[PDB]
Paper text:
The essential l,d-transpeptidase of [name] ([name]) catalyses the formation of 3→3 cross-links in cell wall peptidoglycan and is a target for development of antituberculosis therapeutics. Whereas the d,d-transpeptidases catalyse the formation of 4→3 cross-links between peptidoglycan pentapeptide chains, the functionally related l,d-transpeptidases (Ldts) catalyse the formation of 3→3 cross-links between tetrapeptide chains. The Ldts, which do not manifest structural homology with the PBPs and likely originate from a different evolutionary precursor, share a common YkuD fold (named after the first identified member of this class), distinguished by a β-sandwich with two mixed β-sheets and one helix, and a set of four loops. The established substrate for [name] is the disaccharide tetrapeptide monomer 1 (GlcNAc-MurNAc-l-Ala-d-iGluNH2-m-DAPNH2-d-Ala).
We were interested in assessing the transpeptidase activity of the active site cysteine to serine mutant of [name] (LdtMt2C354S), in part because previous reports have shown that in contrast to wild-type LdtMt213,21, LdtMt2C354S is unable to form a covalent complex with several penem and carbapenem derivatives.
Residue numbers in the entry:
A (entry chain B): 1 to 4
B (entry chain A): 58 to 407
């Protein structure tokens, strides 16, 4: 992963 | 003449973006009927123009779908019919935009328009193009990215009181690069209120609040000590808190390190992402107006901190001058105005  | 059918897509097209409706137009005749179904066979809501020359979809189109368009036209020289099948964009990822200030809010003359995406934006240009700012009275403005996810928009000078701002983030269907597409559109509106500028002067150690050029409050303050001074420059008022625990570790400084701290305080107004607040400081009342004793925050009296909370709003301005610190970074998050206009206007969409 990379959302937020 | 035989009627001619034109469409906003072509047969066999792929990557059709859903940021605009699909349309069919007739020439040398009129459209008798137009139907559009998706790959599961359900119809798509559309509307034929009164004059019968243009048909357009009326509902949001979907990602990664196959649609089949069927159009029939009539003219003096016979009828014309076409069928088209096309595929819409298939994102690798979706990103949702979050806009500040809130819809219907009244904010100070320093409030930038902020569009925070929840993913890295590879094609910053595409993002800027999808965001429409409208101002009344119209005033010039420009985009500038604070990081890979949040972009800001502001004029050259502080907003004029009474200005109405409208923001349309039309990112649904927009290819933001590397397979990233917008998840939804956002529409917000806000209004600029009174000019509120508070000046924290280290030469007098007083925080003076001016509303439309009128002095309404004078607050003794104790700012950051020489080793941890308060930086000079323009600060934008962020969030207001009836009470908050200031935690140095939020900014990367361990609480038990020499410059660390954990303090529960009242009436805290955030003016920088780096951790600067206007807050109640009953422990430094004697020092307020004489000596700097804090880690960078503006210590003021309980009553004055509460007054600040009750009478200062999001987007108002705090200007710090004559301190021994440097200048607040322009990309702090609330230091937008410390970036020269020429640099802001030039932007950094790359
Ligand atoms: Cl379906």
């Amino acid at each position: 992963a990379x959302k937020x | 003449l035989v009627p001619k059918l034109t469409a906003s897509v072509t047969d066999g097209a792929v990557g059709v973006t859903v940021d605009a409706p699909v349309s069919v137009t007739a020439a040398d005749g009129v459209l008798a009927a137009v139907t559009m179904v998706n790959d599961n066979g359900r119809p798509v809501a559309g509307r034929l123009s009164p004059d019968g020359l243009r048909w357009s979809t009326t509902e949001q189109l979907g990602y990664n779908r196959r649609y089949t368009l069927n159009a029939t036209a009539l003219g003096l020289g016979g009828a014309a019919t076409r069928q088209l099948t096309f595929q819409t964009s298939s994102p690798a990822h979706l990103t949702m935009p979050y806009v500040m200030p809130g819809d219907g809010e009244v904010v100070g003359v320093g409030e930038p328009v902020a569009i925070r995406f929840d993913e890295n934006i590879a094609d910053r240009g595409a993002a800027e193009k999808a965001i429409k700012i409208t101002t009344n009275p119209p005033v010039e403005g420009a985009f500038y990215w604070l990081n890979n996810r949040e972009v800001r928009w502001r004029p050259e000078h502080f907003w004029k009181p009474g200005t109405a701002v409208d923001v349309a983030v039309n990112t649904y269907g927009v290819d933001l690069g590397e397979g990233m597409f917008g998840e939804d559109n956002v529409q917000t509106h806000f209004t600029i209120g009174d000019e509120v500028i508070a000046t924290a002067d280290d030469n007098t150690k007083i925080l003076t609040v001016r509303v439309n050029g009128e002095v309404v409050k004078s607050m003794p303050t104790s700012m950051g000590k020489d080793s941890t001074p308060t930086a000079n420059g323009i600060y934008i008022v962020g969030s207001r808190y009836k009470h908050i625990i200031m935690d140095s570790s939020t900014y990367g400084v361990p609480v038990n390190s020499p410059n660390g701290y954990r303090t529960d305080v009242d009436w805290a107004t955030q003016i920088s992402y780096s951790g600067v607040f206007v807050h109640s400081a009953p422990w430094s009342v004697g020092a307020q107006g004489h000596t700097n004793t804090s880690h960078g925050s503006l210590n003021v009296s309980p009553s004055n901190a509460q007054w600040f909370y009750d009478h200062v709003k999001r987007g108002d301005i705090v200007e710090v001058v004559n301190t021994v610190g440097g200048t607040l970074p322009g990309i702090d998050g609330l230091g937008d105005w410390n970036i020269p206009w020429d640099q802001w206007r030039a932007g950094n969409a790359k």
